Design a protein around this ligand. Structure first.
Ligand SMILES: Nc1nc2c(ncn2[C@@H]2O[C@H](COP(=O)(O)OP(=O)(O)O)[C@@H](O)[C@H]2O)c(=O)[nH]1
Ligand SMILES: [Mg+2]
Lengths: 162, 392
């Protein structure tokens, strides 16, 4: 088949170069959506969560045995989040989140504190690398761009983790 | 009317409309060419098939065309397709690759094309499903070019491959708005009639019989007993003893079934054939009697293998590069080395991989030949000869 037109279609519809790449892309996105539907809530939020995931790098569903120590950055006096990080040496921007967050009751802006969690049960988690997203949440006025180079974990079972 | 049997099935990604296309096929064929329609829910709720190996949830349906009788296979999940394809449990003379045009190609699509190439599926017809959800024809054109690229990628004639645009759901519900409904599925069946060739009958294939046992009486002669897999052996016909050692040439002086001495031995029959001027030291197990120049022995070959999980009786441990499992070919056990694919050095029980096997003894083999992999005499995996690796 004559090229150029294939290039025309690829450029027109989003496609970028090799087919295998976009195929893996689609597969990872599908895996994310499937996880969000399969585990607890799947409303409007699922899309916003989805924006935070980078699908070029592989995003896989995994089951985690108890006793695994994972940690997460959370604003001072803020409730436990759904996102977690494997290694403490990861920068906050790398996780697709603002280094600092809002602190309620105080209503003041304060650096996010790293908290250490352990698994008390066997829990299902969605492994994924963070996308480079803008972090308008956790800062009322500041919108914060994030590098998003690091891996993430997602589980709405807060009781199982926290 | 006279119509011959042909084996087909639906393959593709999840939720792309495999089962839906199946129900559409049986419905349209029932309404058009006559027959018994089938239910979506019955097929989707695929019953477990026990087989002789791992439990595979497989749905079998049947539908007749104008000139053919079609036996169709559908599976709920990709794992089912892996187990069903790699093992002989389902034979397809033609494959129907259904791909959602609205979503485009997906990992299991390309993986199913790859598996079709490896396991020996000779022909693939592509049905571009969910064409009702797409208003832009340019997208259909693009996805068409994409699936053609995938087919060309895995040695399928994608340029000449018949691609049909339509919607399995719109066809099943009997509306046929535009050209997408029952007309499209009708054209699909017609395409199955015109593109997919007729299966060669096992009795029309060249002669092939795995030697099960060998009886030799010094002065009287040697007779080899076993079950004829392919073709027909006749008295005074020349045959080749292939496998284990050097290929030998012989002549069938007689065919014996129980007490009876027959004019010939046909496929499916358990017989004992007398070999002229042969000795027991010349004939071993695993060797096969074949039509001259139809089969050859090989030691090193690329194959696709599926490892049994711990539940289905498989091992509790992954593989290495120096793994030396037993390989069961037809009627014999043969020790052989195995080479893992690039980037991988560990495979868990339940995975399917492209493995390069190098046997210690040459075995008469062909492309597409299914074989077993055993540990301590018990099956730990199953595979199929993807491609013979020549040494020249
Ligand atoms: N909107 C729409 N949905 C479809 C169409 N074809 C199939 N589907 C949906 O795809 C879903 C999956 O069906 P299917 O892929 O055949 O089941 P599977 O064989 O187990 O993967 C069904 O629930 C259908 O509702 C279509 O043309 N339009
Ligand atoms: Mg199904």
């Amino acid at each position: 088949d004559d090229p150029q037109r294939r290039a025309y279609l690829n450029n027109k519809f989003g496609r970028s170069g090799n087919l295998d790449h976009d195929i893996n892309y689609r597969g990872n996105r599908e895996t994310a959506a499937k996880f969000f539907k399969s585990k607890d809530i799947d409303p409007a939020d699922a899309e916003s969560y989805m924006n935070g995931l980078d699908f070029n790098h592989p995003v896989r569903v995994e089951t985690l045995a108890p006793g695994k120590n994972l940690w997460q950055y959370q604003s001072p006096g803020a409730p436990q989040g759904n996102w977690y990080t494997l290694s403490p040496r990861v920068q906050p921007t790398e996780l697709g989140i603002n280094p600092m967050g809002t602190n309620r009751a105080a209503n003041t802006i304060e650096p996010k504190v790293l908290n250490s969690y352990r698994t008390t049960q066997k829990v299902e988690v969605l492994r994924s690398t963070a996308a480079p997203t803008d972090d308008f949440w956790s800062v009322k006025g500041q919108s914060y761009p994030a590098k998003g180079g690091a891996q993430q974990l997602f589980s709405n079972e807060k009781g199982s983790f926290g | 009317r006279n119509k011959p049997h042909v084996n087909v099935g639906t393959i593709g990604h999840v939720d792309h409309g495999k089962t839906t296309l199946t129900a559409a096929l049986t419905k349209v064929c029932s309404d058009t060419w006559g027959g018994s329609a089938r239910a979506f829910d019955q097929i989707d709720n695929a019953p477990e098939e026990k087989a002789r190996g791992i439990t595979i949830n497989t749905s079998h349906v049947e539908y007749d065309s104008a000139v053919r009788h079609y036996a169709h296979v559908d599976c709920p999940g990709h794992a089912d397709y892996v187990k069903n394809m790699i093992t002989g449990a389902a034979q397809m003379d033609g494959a129907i690759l259904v791909c959602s045009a609205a979503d485009g190609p997906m990992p299991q699509t390309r993986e199913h094309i790859l598996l079709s190439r490896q396991v020996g599926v000779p022909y693939i017809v592509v049905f571009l499903n969910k064409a009702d959800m797409v208003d832009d024809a340019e997208l259909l054109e693009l996805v068409e070019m994409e699936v053609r690229d995938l087919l060309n990628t895995y040695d399928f004639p994608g340029d000449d491959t018949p691609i049909i645009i339509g919607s399995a759901l719109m066809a099943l519900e009997g509306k046929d708005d535009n050209g997408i409904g029952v007309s499209a599925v009708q054209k699909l069946v017609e395409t199955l009639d015109s593109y997919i060739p007729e299966p060669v009958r096992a009795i029309d294939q060249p002669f092939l019989m795995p030697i099960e046992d060998v009886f030799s009486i010094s002065g009287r002669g040697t007779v080899v007993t076993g079950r004829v897999e392919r073709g027909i052996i006749k008295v005074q016909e020349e045959v080749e003893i292939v496998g284990i050692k050097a290929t030998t040439k012989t002549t069938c002086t007689g065919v014996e079934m129980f007490r009876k001495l027959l004019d010939e031995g046909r496929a499916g029959e358990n017989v004992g054939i007398l070999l002229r001027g042969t000795k027991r030291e010349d004939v071993e197990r695993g060797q096969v009697l074949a039509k001259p120049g139809t089969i050859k022995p090989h030691t090193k070959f690329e194959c696709e293998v599926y490892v049994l999980s711990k539940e289905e009786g498989g091992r509790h441990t992954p593989f290495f590069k120096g793994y030396r499992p037993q390989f069961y070919f037809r009627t014999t056990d043969v020790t052989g080395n195995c080479e893992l694919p690039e980037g991988v050095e560990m495979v868990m029980p339940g995975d399917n991989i492209k493995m390069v096997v190098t046997l210690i003894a040459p075995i008469a083999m062909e492309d597409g030949l299914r074989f077993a992999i055993r540990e301590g005499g018990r099956t730990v995996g199953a595979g199929v000869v993807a491609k013979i690796i020549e040494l020249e």
